[PDB]
């Protein structure tokens, strides 16, 4: 809404330092390394392209508010998350043991801190089993 | 400096150990150097070329030995990078590996010889040529292919050996007296071997027409069965390489799957409205209006990671797509079962609402 | 003792008959012994090595004969293990099999020779070498592959034979007078054979340039068509071995399916609440608070057996998963047909409830 | 419930001879050979692992009574039994002849006594046909 | 008699034309006869064997000619069976086919020779050996495989020819003076050919070490590229034979499909209750309480035909089951679309019934 | 005339550039001419044939040079057809391509030689033969296959080289003194190479029995590993050609897809009842009761284009049909999800209507 | 019912000439040759076996009445007829031209007389198109 | 209806110049090149054949009115258009960018003028996104 629009304006000002209404790859890079993460030029190019819809190398405010309002229900990531967990389900049981989650979560991809896996199991081990049904996890993430 | 020192040590260890790009070029250059050394040794064996060949061989071998020494020292000094081996104790522990034993034995033999030597030089050259592999990849591949096709290879050996024995014996009988090439069964066996392999030196060949006819009738089948293993091994090599490529593809799938799950959880736990999410905000704070910017970063990372993973789910095979779609087929089973349960509820209500 | 006697009889019969592990090692050792005997015979044929070769051959052959005799006696005495053959009558009945006929004839010929003999020794050695197979697996595989690719092999033979005949005749015409190698068409045929097979002894080769050109033009095609059968046989061998492995996989699937059905029925019929289940409790009583323990062990057996069977349902092939999933697709068809019937009921009721 | 809890306590005491609350593989082997069946050490190990949930090499009471209350409908063995019978249906007719059941039931896997196959046919030939539809049989075991 | 006469004519035509079982045995026997004639001719060429070889060849050739004459007469006299050719006019029309032209020309040449002749005999024998095929199956298969793999074969030829030319020229340069084997570039080309094909006669071989090194470096690649076509042709032969077998399987599927549809319609149109079915009863009457027996016959024929067709729908391939199941998948799509339409009707009624 | 001039220029450019039909026949004829030139040169190298060979070669080479020059001029003059190169400037720009550099260098060398020449003639012949390709298709295919099977080829090279070195060294040791063929390790290496490749010249062969035993034991494995690359390359060639054919099939699919979408939109936008469709009517008007005739044309075009595209969706592969059917499977997932949503609506209404 | 049972009794007496209650393959051969169709011994044997349920080589009255009452809807020939017509649909259009039916019906399998194909098209060309939708044909035959 | 029947009379008169009731391939060719498009004899033959139902090489008026009344919903082109757009969807996203449509529509098959692509995007870019969901496009074209 209007208040969300103002928040998005503050966010755009944070990103679009130049204030020209277009986020440059260097602006996003500097804000990233300010956040403490160092991206690569090609990685940031793929990033902006994944958001870029006008083919300009930047993002205008309408696209930024589109990404902000883009709920992950629309993204249709159910199949993708299902496939990822199936990839990590070495048995095909339809679940995955907690220990495997602890090992993979903090050792693969963008390794997460122990806090992230703790909240993962908190919102995943609803039945307190440890052998979380990944399908249920993606369903609750969707819901 | 110090961090740069560790970074350079790791980079050079990667160069010496599993290489990907330009380290392969360096390995190719050192392989070319050692191959030139071997070729120069072979030339030096030629009498008319002995002088210049040996003259160049001495300097090329000193270059080879200095290169080998610096490589081994850099390997030992860079063995500390890996968590398995650290410090002087770790480097010395790593040096105990059998491959390092081979390398050091070759080094000491070469330095002793430099500081009847032709045979020792030949042995050392073959040893370093074998050392070039550094991973046993070729030997492992050959062994795997031989084991996989053990039955076919053993059947080929059995049938070919029986054919060789029978053909040699029959030709020996047919040419015992007329031809002096087959005065002994051992000579006939040598002929049979050099024929069925299609080498055909020509030192021994049948001359009697009975011998010629038997030789033809048997050599057709024998050459077929002796050429079998080449094709068997080619097929096995191709199959094993394809299998290894498939496994590598599946690992390259495994990594972006973790990336996607990570980003999805991060973006689901960075939601502004939801509470009890400081467990994720603390991570971004440690890395360091900022809330909405962080959420934008997170959703963007989720989008790019989902794109990466989806591209990573390439077919690559019939079985791969069959499995991926069978997952969805089981999902369809579950959904249609749920619909069946709901329709059962409806038909149960039917009498109630009537 | 007696039970141990029967157990040892069966175990040694398994070792001598179809081997799996260390019995294969024993078979390899006896194969090595007989191969060394053959090699020593071949060496003894060499004149300069005759003395020591024959001296070692005598003792190695006596060792071979005692080993063969003890093996045959153990075969006869362990032939009673199987249910097909039991007792002295059963063992004698088994001894009538053709392979036992071969073994006994070889044994008696060898003992007669030991207790112009070189040719008989060679024949006997070849016969025992053939006897090494014990199952005809190699011969059966070769015959199956030849029969499967009969059309390709026969086409290769026809084309290659026509090429050989035509090339030999043309080269003979081109070299009838100039070259003494081709004074007769039989010599030209021998040349064409030893060329198209790429043996190339060198005893006969064209020298006139017309002959050389004709030989080149025809030998390209001829060597192609003569090397065809090796590749055909390699492909056939690989295909047949894969088919046999697939059949073995399906039998290894069949057995755990029986295990799973057995355990499932036992678990379902050992339910505590249900009655008229004495047909299952009596089995556990014959094998032998206890009721609940029996139920627990039965259900846990069901879990483990289901795990085993599910692991046993490995794809192993595209067709395998296709068939397994087609079963589920037919199940989906049935379920959706049921839903169609129920919706037909609902639409029929719609007018009634309106 | 409470009475079933007491029954499971008696069962656990029968299993857990040591009384420590943890069933040892050796105790399971002893009770099995008391029952007249001889399992193997690796067989029993995989067995407990399948029934194990805490990864301790033994079983505590809660896992035991969860398995005891674990109905086979939850286990979802419909597909597995379907596949087994399909494997034994060499024609694909959707059924299987009685004589094939007599042969298979007492020759492969864990051979069953003639009484077991008798009860099998009793609960299978509901229509008295002999060519039992295995799908119906698994459906009945599920219901 | 007369009907038996036509039946025997047709059966013998089937034996002479496309054979399946024992007709193949007869064809094999006649092929063996002609092959023995060719072998006896080759033997007769040998000088020391000329007398007896020719003596046996005369009688074997008269036997061959009488067999060929009776076979050709039976072919002409049985050519009337087929609807295409009937009577004397039909038989004479059939005799005009090019293959019969080849057969008759061979026959007349042979009878003229029998009633410098060695070369004519050789030509005639080659012609009849070619005539053995009777269907061009081998030639058609080879041509199809060559056309299918035209690009690979032509690439192999181009690369191998360039390698041969370059290697021959380089070795000629390196051995122009020192070695008398390479006094001309044509000699070097002959050497390069007999090396890259791995024939290696030994009449010409490099002796200077520069020539030996060049020969090694080029012969590795050359033998690889010259052995390529054998593998290419083997793979092509296997693929084409598999394709032909698949087509035959699909025709064997086509026929029982007609059987099943025929029996299904007969059983549906022979229903007792239904009327206006005389179109089916008349057929069973002209073939000839009875009505019910006819109905039992019809339904029972339908059962057997359905079994035959169902067992005729064997997978035989991944693509085959994929297509069969895709038909059902499209059926499922139609059924779920129908259910969607019905649910749309229900949701439309929901507001109305509320 | 002028339009005809451009049409003829384009047609001849297509003939010279990528040909499909009879332009391939012209290319084959010019290839045959140049091949005859090369063969006549080789003949001219033969001393006894020098006179007539050179006499014919002169005139055949003048014919070749005139044909080559006219072809090059027509290529330059027809290079203006393509939009990339137009006019004199465009033709001159195109002439800069490396292939035209090779062509012009060959032309100038030939015209200089015509207007120690044997070696230059041979070099020019080889260069033009290489020039015959005009697309690098063979070289590109070979490079792609080598790169794809780099691991198998390198493993074969490594193992075969080690086998060659070891066998040559062992035979040299076993035949250093007895045999004069192996007086130097280089001679033994030459023997090992001409043995493992199965060329078997026969100039060098082992004669001592230790040497013969070692030679056999090593040559079995060596010939296997030296024949490996031929099969590897054959399989790679077949695979790459199949892949290229699949890509061509997919492009032939791409074009009719555009045709179908075009015709479908035209037919949807040519509807008589619908308005605001002048955007499509203007197209037909500019191309020129007429309205209905145009609509009939449009619907007819839609039908034919749909038929063309549907036929263009041939299976051609297991993966192709799997992907096509997986699209429909995802569609089925969507439809069943919609039905689940509607059934959820119904179950929510259930309590409300009650 | 009872009248149909009597009709089946008459049919069985026509088949079971011996009157022993078991129809012999030779009796079936005689009745077939009387009907004008000559079957083979193996053909008739496999035929009765497809009809045989007691594994006796003959048929008792209960099996005869079972096959008489065996409606083709139970047989579930929808898929089989669908596959047959698809096999004969060389284009996959979901239909088949009348001329193809004329050719195939009278040239393949058990060739049918012109009258049979005439009634086939009569009951198939419900819309009078000739390009009969074989799905419709199998559906009506089932219905 | 009757008025459309008379419109079809006029259309057939325009096509069937000879007036014999049979449209000849030459008549179709002349009317085509009058329309400004030049077809090939085999192309026109396949054209009529795909529309031809009586196998006569021409079209009687009943077939012409059938094709006129033949709405594309009956044609069942949903799958075909779906497959075409999927072929042109190089990513499989379920959509396609506007620029790719501009390039393809006017470069392959029967190239369409800029006006046609303009109306295509007008009636396709209902949400003004450019990344038209081709599923929606075929659905609306069907609806
Ligand atoms: C009918 C066969 C078997 C093929 C196809 C037709 C032709 C042109 C040759 C045959 C063939 C060779 O016989 C040999 C090579 C290797 C290179 C030879 C160098 C001149 C390639 C090569 O395609
Ligand atoms: C371009 C071809 C055909 C390959 C790839 C490039 C190279 C390194 C050699 C060819 C090749 C041989 O020609 C022969 C062998 C067998 C062992 C030879 C021993 C030195 C392997 C081997 O890869």
Ligand 2: centre distance to CA F156 (Å): 7
Q: What does the block give as tokens for C152?
A: 């390709």
Q: If 0-12 CB within 10 Å is exposed, 13-18 middle and 19+ buried, where does residue C96 land?
A: exposed
How far apart are alpha carbons F48 and F46 in whole angstroms? 6
If you measure CA to CA, which chain F residue comes closest to E165? F126
- Chain C contact present for D120, CB below 8 A: yes
Helix (H, G, I), strand (E, B) or coil at A70: coil
Calculate ∠ Cα C184-C185-C189, nearest 5°.
125
Place of tokens 């219901």: D143
Picking from G29, G106, G34, the residue whose alpha carbon sits closest to that of residue E287 is: G34
Cα angle for residues E238, E241, E242 (degrees, 5° grid): 85
HSE-CB of D123 using CA atoms within 13 angstroms: 19
**Token pair listed for G23:** 């129809």
Residues E238 and C149 sit within 8 Å (Cβ to Cβ): yes
Q: Which residues of C245-275 are buried (b: 16+ CB within 10 A; e: fewer)?
A: eeeebeeebbebbbbbbbbbbbbbbbeeeee
Residue E199: Cβ within 10 Å count: 27
Q: Return d(Cα H100, Cα C110) in angstroms, integer.
A: 86
Nearest to H94 by CA among H102, H82, H77: H82
Atom nearest to E226 CA in ligand 1? 16
User: What is the rounded distance in angstroms from the CA atom of residue A116 to the CA atom of residue B278?
Assistant: 10
Closest CA to C229 of C197, C199, C255: C197
| Beta-carbon count within 10 A of F245 CB | 12
Contact A45, A59 (CB under 8 A): no
Count, residues in chain D? 143
Q: Could you give the angle at which helices E209-269 and C150-174 cross, rounded to 10 degrees?
A: 140
Q: Which ligand is nearest to the CA of C163?
A: 1
Distance between CA E94 and CA C11 in Å, rounded?
71
CB-ligand 1 contact for E192 (6 Å cutoff): no
Query: Residue H85 has which token pair?
Result: 């757009």
Which 3 state secondary structure label does DSSP give E183? Answer: coil
The fourth-level CATH superfamily of domain B2-135 is Voltage-gated potassium channels. Chain C (1.20.120.350)
* Residues across chain C: 354
Beta strands in F241-346 (DSSP E): none
Residue D132: φ, ψ to 5°: -60, 135
Q: CA of B283 to nearest chain F CA: how many angstroms apart?
A: 37
Confirm if C219 and E199 have CB atoms less than 8 A apart.
yes
On whether the CB atoms of residues F91 and F76 are closer than 8 A, the answer is yes
What are F341-347's contacts with CB under 8 Å, separation 24+?
Answer: F342/E343, F342/E347, F343/B339, F343/B342, F343/B343, F343/E343, F345/E347, F346/B342, F346/B346, F346/E346, F346/E347, F346/E350, F347/B342, F347/B345, F347/B346
In order of F193, G51, G80, the CA distances from G67 in angstroms are 77, 8, 19
Give domain limits for chain E: 2-135, 146-241, 321-348
Copy the structure tokens of residue B146.
Answer: 């031989």
Considering only CB atoms, G47 lies closest to which of E264, E269, E304, namely E304
Q: Cβ distance E170 to E218 under 8 Å?
A: yes
Rounded distance, CA E300 to CA G23, Å?
14
Structural tokens at position G69 = 């009452």
Ligand 2: which atom is nearest the Cα of residue F153? 23
Question: Chains D, G: CB contacts under 8 A, how many?
Answer: 3
* Mutation for testing the B interface, residue in F145, F185, F327 having most B CBs under 10 Å: F185
- Structure-block tokens of residue C151: 């059309």
The CA distance from F291 to F338, in Å, is: 41
State whether residue A96 is helix, strand or coil.
strand
C-alpha B180/C-alpha B171 separation (Å) is 12
The burial of E315, by beta-carbon neighbours within 10 Å (0-12 exposed, 13-18 middle, 19 or more buried), is given as: middle
Whether the CB-CB separation of D131 and D95 falls below 8 Å is answered with yes
Q: How far is the CA of E200 from the centre of ligand 1 (A)?
A: 18
> Distance between CA E323 and CA E313 in Å, rounded?
12
> What span, in angstroms and rounded, lies between the C-alpha atoms of F46 and F50?
6
What is the nearest CA distance from F4 to chain C, expressed in angstroms? Answer: 46
Tokens 């064209």 belong to C206
Contacts 24+ apart (CB under 8 A), H115-124: H115/F279, H115/F280, H115/F282, H115/F283, H116/F265, H116/F266, H116/F269, H116/F279, H116/F280, H116/F283, H118/F279, H119/F269, H119/F277, H119/F279, H119/F280, H120/F265, H123/F269
Instruction: Tell me the β-bridge partners of F106.
Output: none
Contacts of B276 (CB under 8 A, 6+ apart): none
Structural resolution in Å: 3.1
Other CB atoms within a 10 A radius of the CB of residue B309 amount to 26
CA of residue D109 to ligand 2 center, whole Å: 53
Q: What is the dihedral of CA C211, C214, C218, C223, to 10 degrees?
A: 40
**Nearest residue of H to residue A76, measured between CA atoms:** H93
Nearest to C202 by CA among E194, F198, E201: E201
Distance of alpha carbon A96 from alpha carbon A102, whole angstroms: 11
G85 touches chain E (CB under 8 A): yes
Rounded Cα distance between C102 and B71, Å, is: 63
Query: Rounded CA gap, C303 and C296, in Å?
Result: 11
The gap from C-alpha C29 to its chain's centroid, in whole angstroms, comes to 20
Q: Which of F190-205 are b and which e, b meaning 16 or more Cβ less than 10 Å from the residue's Cβ? A: bbbbbbbbbbbbbbbb
- Helix/strand/coil (H, E, C) string of C13-34? HHHHCCCCCHHHHHHHHHHHHH
- Which site among F117, F135, F138, F343 would you substitute to test the E interface, given the most E Cβ atoms closer than 10 Å to its Cβ? F138
Q: Are G82 and G43 in contact (CB under 8 A)?
A: no
DSSP readout, B121-152? HHHHHHHHHHHT-SS-HHHHHHHHHHHHTHHH
Q: How far is CA H10 from CA C111, F293, H7, H28, H70, in A?
A: 109, 9, 5, 15, 18
C-alpha closest to that of F269 among H108, H103, H121: H121
Rounded-to-integer distance, Cα D138 and Cα D89, Å:
14
What SS3 state is found at A65?
helix
Residue E161 Cβ < 6 Å to ligand 1: yes
Q: Which residues pair with residue D96 across a beta bridge? A: D132
Q: Where are the alpha helices (DSSP H) in A2-126?
A: 2-15, 25-35, 41-51, 61-69, 72-75, 78-88, 98-105, 114-124
Cα D33-D35-D37 angle, rounded to 5 deg: 55
d(CA A83, CA E349): 39
CB-hemisphere CA count at 13 Å for B61?
22
Of residues E129, E230, E318, nearest to C318 (C-beta): E318
Residue nearest atom 6 of ligand 1, based on CA coordinates: E153
Tokens of C212: 């050389």
Task: Compute the half-sphere exposure of residue C220: CA atoms within 13 Å on the CB side of its CA.
Answer: 18
Cβ of E188 less than 6 Å from ligand 1: no
**Closest Cα in chain C, distance from residue E91 (Å):** 30
Q: Which residues from E are below 8 Å from B213, CB to CB? A: none
- Rounded Cα gap, residues A31 and A25, in angstroms: 10
Q: Are C192 and C226 in contact (CB under 8 A)?
A: no
Query: Which one of G51, G64, G107 has the shortest CB-CB distance to E303?
Result: G51
CB C200 within 8 A of CB C194: yes
Is residue F156 in contact with ligand 2, taking CB distance under 6 Å?
yes
Known binder of ligand: residue G18?
A: yes
CA-nearest residue to G81 within chain E is E261
- Name residue, tokens 């009937």: E86
E333 exposure class (CB count in 10 Å sphere: 0-12, 13-18, 19+)? middle
Would you tell me the crossing angle of helices G2-15 and E290-312 to the nearest 10 degrees? 80
CA distance F295 to F281: 10
Name the DSSP class of G129: -
- Strand-pairing partners, residue G96, are G132
Q: Which residue in the block uniquely carries the two structure tokens 């029969």? A: C147
- CA distances E284 to B48, D89, E278, E281, E288, Å, are 101, 37, 10, 5, 6
Nearest to F268 by CA among F306, F221, F238, F237: F306
Helix/strand/coil (H/E/C) assignment for every residue in D29-80: HHHHHHHCCCCCHHHHHHHHHHHCCCCCCCCCHHHHHHHHHCCHHHHCCHHH
- Asked whether the beta carbons of C293 and D113 are under 8 A apart, the reply is no
What is the residue with the minimal CA distance to atom 10 of ligand 1? Answer: C221
- DSSP reduced 3-state for B117: helix
Q: G132 has which bridge partners?
A: G96
Residue H96's beta-bridge partner residues? Answer: H132
Ligand 1 pocket check for C297: Cβ under 6 Å: no
**If you measure from the C-alpha of residue C211 to the centroid of ligand 1, how many angstroms do you get, rounded to a whole number?**
19
Find out whether C256 and D73 touch, Cβ atoms under 8 Å: no
Long-range contacts of F113-118 (CB under 8 A, 24+ apart): F114/F61, F114/F62, F114/F65, F118/F45
Give distance in angstroms: CA of G56 to centre of ligand 1.
64
The region that residue E314 occupies, defined by phi over 0 for left and psi between -120 and 50 for alpha, beta otherwise, is: beta
C176 — alpha (psi -120 to 50), left (phi > 0) or beta? alpha
Give the Cα separation of F32 and F38 in Å (integer): 10
Task: Kindly report the nearest CA distance between residue D137 and chain C, in angstroms.
Answer: 10
CATH of F136-314, picked from 1.10.1370.30, 3.40.50.1820, 3.20.20.70, 1.10.287.70, is: 1.10.287.70
Nearest one of B211, B42, B226 to B122, comparing CA atoms: B42
Structure tokens at F321: 């049909």
Which conformational region is residue D59 in: left (phi greater than 0), alpha (psi within -120 to 50 degrees), or beta? Answer: beta
- State the Cα–Cα distance between residues F166 and C299, nearest whole angstrom: 63
Whole-number Å distance between alpha carbons of B326 and C329: 10
Query: B181, B175 in Cβ contact below 8 A?
Result: yes
Place of tokens 């970074």: B7
Cβ atoms B348, C346 nearer than 8 A = no
- The residue behind tokens 């499977």 is F329
Determine whether the shortest distance from the Cβ of E157 to ligand 1 is under 6 A: yes
Task: Name the burial class of residue B90, with classes exposed (0-12), middle (13-18) and buried (19+) by CB atoms within 10 angstroms of its CB.
Answer: middle
Separation between Cα atoms, residue H112 and residue H118, nearest integer Å: 10
* Range E146-241 classified under CATH 3.40.50.2300: no
Angle at F52 between CA F50 and CA F58, to 5 degrees: 95
Give B195-220 as a DSSP string.
HHTS---SSS---SHHHHHHHHHHHH
**What tokens appear for A4 in the block?**
């969300």
Top CATH class, C146-233? mainly alpha
Distance CA B141, CA B147 (A): 10
Residue C344 CA to residue C339 CA, distance in Å, equals 8
Q: Which helix (H) or strand (E) holds C40?
A: helix C22-45
CA distance F72 to F16: 9
**Count of helix runs (H) and strand runs (E) in chain A:** 9, 0
Q: In whole angstroms, what is the distance from residue H130 CA to residue H124 CA?
A: 9
**Is H46 part of any known ligand binding site?**
no
DSSP at B181: G
Chains H and F touch (3+ CB pairs under 8 A): yes
Cα separation, F152 vs B241, in Å, equals 7
Q: What is the CATH number of domain F2-134?
A: 1.20.120.350
From the number of C-beta atoms within 10 Å of its C-beta (0-12, 13-18, 19+), residue F133 rates as: middle
Measured CA to CA, the distance from residue E210 to residue E175 in angstroms comes to: 8
Domain encompassing residue D38? 6-69
CA distance E303 to H98: 58
- Is any atom of ligand 1 closer than 6 Å to the C-beta of E148? no
E strand segments, H3-137: none
Task: State how far the Cα of G134 lies from the Cα of G132, in Å rounded to an integer.
Answer: 6
**For residues B219 and B199, what is the distance between their CA atoms, to the nearest angstrom?**
12
Burial of A47 (0-12, 13-18, 19+ CB in 10 A): buried
CATH number, domain of G41, equals 1.10.238.10
What is the spatial distance between Cα B110 and Cα E163, in angstroms, rounded to a whole number?
A: 40
- Hey, which of E143, E150, E153, E219 would you mutate to test ligand 1's pocket, going by the most ligand atoms within 8 Å of its Cβ? E153
Tell me how far apart the alpha carbons of residues D134 and C260 are, in angstroms, rounded to a whole number.
Answer: 14
């Amino acid at each position: 809404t209007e208040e969300q629009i103002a928040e998005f304006k503050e966010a755009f000002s944070l990103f679009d330092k130049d204030g020209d209404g277009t986020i440059t790859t260097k602006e996003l890079g500097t804000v990233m390394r300010s956040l403490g993460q160092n991206p690569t030029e090609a990685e940031l190019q793929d990033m902006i392209n994944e958001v870029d819809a006008d083919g300009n190398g930047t993002i205008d405010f309408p696209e930024f508010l589109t990404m902000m309002a883009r709920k992950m229900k629309d993204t249709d990531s159910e199949e993708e998350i299902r496939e990822a967990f199936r990839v990590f389900d070495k048995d095909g049981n339809g679940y995955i043991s907690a220990a495997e989650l602890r090992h993979v979560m903090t050792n693969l991809g963008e390794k997460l801190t122990d806090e992230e896996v703790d909240e993962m199991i908190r919102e995943a081990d609803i039945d307190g089993d440890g052998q979380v049904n990944y399908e249920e996890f993606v369903q609750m993430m969707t819901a | 400096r110090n961090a740069f020192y560790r970074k350079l040590q790791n980079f050079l260890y990667n160069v010496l150990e599993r290489p990907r790009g330009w380290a392969f070029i360096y390995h190719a250059y050192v392989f070319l150097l050692v191959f030139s050394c071997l070729v120069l040794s072979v030339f030096s064996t030629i009498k008319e070329y002995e002088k210049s060949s040996e003259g160049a061989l001495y300097i090329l071998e000193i270059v080879t030995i200095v290169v080998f020494g610096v490589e081994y020292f850099v390997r030992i000094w860079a063995a500390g990078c890996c968590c398995r081996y650290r410090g002087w104790r770790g480097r010395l522990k790593f040096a105990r590996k059998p491959f390092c034993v081979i390398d050091i034995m070759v080094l000491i033999a070469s330095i002793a010889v430099l500081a009847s030597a032709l045979r020792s030089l030949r042995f050392l050259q073959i040893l370093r040529m074998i050392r070039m592999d550094r991973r046993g990849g070729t030997w492992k591949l050959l062994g795997s292919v031989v084991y996989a096709h053990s039955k076919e290879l053993v059947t080929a050996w059995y049938i070919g050996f029986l054919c060789l024995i029978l053909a040699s014996f029959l030709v020996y009988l047919a040419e015992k007296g007329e031809n002096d090439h087959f005065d002994t069964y051992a000579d006939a066996l040598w002929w049979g071997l050099i024929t069925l392999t299609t080498i055909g030196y020509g030192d021994k060949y049948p001359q009697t027409w009975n011998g010629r006819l038997l030789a033809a009738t048997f050599t057709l089948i024998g050459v077929s069965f002796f050429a079998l293993p080449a094709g068997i091994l080619g097929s096995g090599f191709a199959l094993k390489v394809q299998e290894q490529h498939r496994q590598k593809h599946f690992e390259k799938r495994r990594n972006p799957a973790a990336g996607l799950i990570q980003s999805a959880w991060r973006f689901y736990a960075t939601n502004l409205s939801r509470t009890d999410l400081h467990s994720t905000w603390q991570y971004y704070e440690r890395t360091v209006g900022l809330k909405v910017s962080i959420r934008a970063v997170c959703v963007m990372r989720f989008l790019v990671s989902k794109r990466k993973f989806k591209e990573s789910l390439r077919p690559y095979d019939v079985m791969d797509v069959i499995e991926q779609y069978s997952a969805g087929h089981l999902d369809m089973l579950s959904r249609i079962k749920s619909l069946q349960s709901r329709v059962d509820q409806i038909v149960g209500r039917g009498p109630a609402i009537t």
